[PDB]
Amino acid sequence: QTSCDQWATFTGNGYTVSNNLWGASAGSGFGCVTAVSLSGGASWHADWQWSGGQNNVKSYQNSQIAIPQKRTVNSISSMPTTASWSYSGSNIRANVAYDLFTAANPNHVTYSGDYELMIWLGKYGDIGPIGSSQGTVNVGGQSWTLYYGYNGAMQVYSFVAQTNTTNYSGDVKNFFNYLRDNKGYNAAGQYVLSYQFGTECFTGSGTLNVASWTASIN
Numbered sequence: 468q469t470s471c472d473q474w475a476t477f478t479g480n481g482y483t484v485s486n487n488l489w490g491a492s493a494g495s496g497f498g499c500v501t502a503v504s505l506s507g508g509a510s511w512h513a514d515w516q517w518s519g520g521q522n523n524v525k526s527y528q529n530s531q532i533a534i535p536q537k538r539t540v541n542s543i544s545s546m547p548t549t550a551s552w553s554y555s556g557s558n559i560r561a562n563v564a565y566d567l568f569t570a571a572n573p574n575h576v577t578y579s580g581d582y583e584l585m586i587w588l589g590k591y592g593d594i595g596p597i598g599s600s601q602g603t604v605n606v607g608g609q610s611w612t613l614y615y616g617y618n619g620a621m622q623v624y625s626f627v628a629q630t631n632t633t634n635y636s637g638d639v640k641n642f643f644n645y646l647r648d649n650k651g652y653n654a655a656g657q658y659v660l661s662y663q664f665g666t667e668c669f670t671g672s673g674t675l676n677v678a679s680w681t682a683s684i685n
């Protein structure tokens with residue numbers, strides 16, 4: 468269904484579609500989300516317009532999966548996902564990104580973590596991820612610009628596609644592994660707290676169509 472309410476949510480079959488206009492107060496405009504299907508994955512689209520607050524995120528419209536039992540990264544065998552999306556509109560300053568928190572305590576709050584992992588399939592405008600570039604890295608047979616920095620106590624690793632990746636098939640475990648193997652990341656001791664995919668919107672007019680998004684933790 469459709470709603471333009473700041474905190475609108477639609478749930479079903481382990482999947483949840485959320486408007487999540489958490490920063491709306493930082494700007495002027497609106498955000499509407501439509502959950503088209505929640506069967507065999509999530510199918511949804513977000514329509515929005517924002518002005519003002521140039522460098523502040525207005526929303527993170529997204530789809531995510533439930534994680535009833537938290538497990539360590541190393542204990543998980545695979546975190547497969549697929550995303551099929553397109554973006555249209557004008558003056559778009561926004562991304563298309565996976566977001567995941569991990570923490571050493573499985574019972575940690577799920578709205579923050581010790582680490583934040585982001586995978587930016589899309590990047591529109593001059594927006595930039597947290598921290599600074601670490602250079603190019605190969606993950607899952609695709610090249611990414613890896614960023615690292617702190618956002619408070621939390622360390623954020625953002626893998627940014629070098630071209631907008633509108634049809635994606637991947638395994639988030641490959642990203643945790645890269646961090647494990649090259650950046651001293653404690654996959655042994657970190658629990659996956661969240662698993663979300665959406666669009667951080669700053670300013671402009673945009674329509675994100677997510678034809679399909681799937682995700683699981685096995």
Ligand SMILES: *[C@@H]1O[C@H](CO)[C@@H](O)[C@H](O)[C@H]1NC(C)=O
Pocket residue numbers: 589590591592628629630631
């Ligand atoms: C995504 O596409 C937009 C609009 O064509 C472009 O300006 C931006 O450079 C692209 N980003 C990436 C990561 O290729």
